[PDB]
Amino acid sequence: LSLMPWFHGKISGQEAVQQLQPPEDGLFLVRESARHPGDYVLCVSFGRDVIHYRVLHRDGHLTIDEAVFFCNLMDMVEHYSKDKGAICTKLVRPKRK
């Protein structure tokens, strides 16, 4: 959370595609969602495109229901820093400020 350099909180997606803009594989950040409150969107750069993955809540947290779920984002994040499978790419540099 707040003190995490990868978290930009409340910026339109629209902003994020921008932040993330000298493309660079695994360049990511995380922001709170608008249409569904309490929820997250993790933004990823991969192949010059920017992909997104809603973070759902289900007793906890996750992107692959059912698959892998977390206690903290600060931890889904770690997780997706060593094994990508599931999303397009391995998270590397957090975009920051």
Q: Is the sign of the CA dihedral 16, 17, 23, 29 positive or negative?
A: positive
Q: Which two tokens stand for residue 28?
A: 């990511």
Cα of first residue to Cα of last residue in the chain, in angstroms, is 13
Other Cβ atoms less than 10 A from the Cβ of 70: the count is 16
- The two beta strands, 40-46 and 49-57, are antiparallel
Where do the structural domains in the chain lie, given as residue ranges? 1-97
Those residues with Cβ within 8 angstroms of residue 40's Cβ, 6 or more apart along the chain or in another chain: 30, 31, 32, 33, 54, 55, 73
Q: Report yes or no: 29 and 16 within 8 Å, Cβ to Cβ.
A: yes
CATH 1.10.3720.10 fits 1-97, yes or no: no
- What's the resolution in A? 2.5
Report phi then psi at 44, rounded to 5.
-115, 130
Q: How far is CA 22 from CA 49, 65, 79, 94, 95, in A?
A: 11, 31, 25, 13, 11
Q: Is 42 exposed, middle or buried (0-12, 13-18, 19+ CB in 10 A)?
A: buried
Experimental method: X-ray
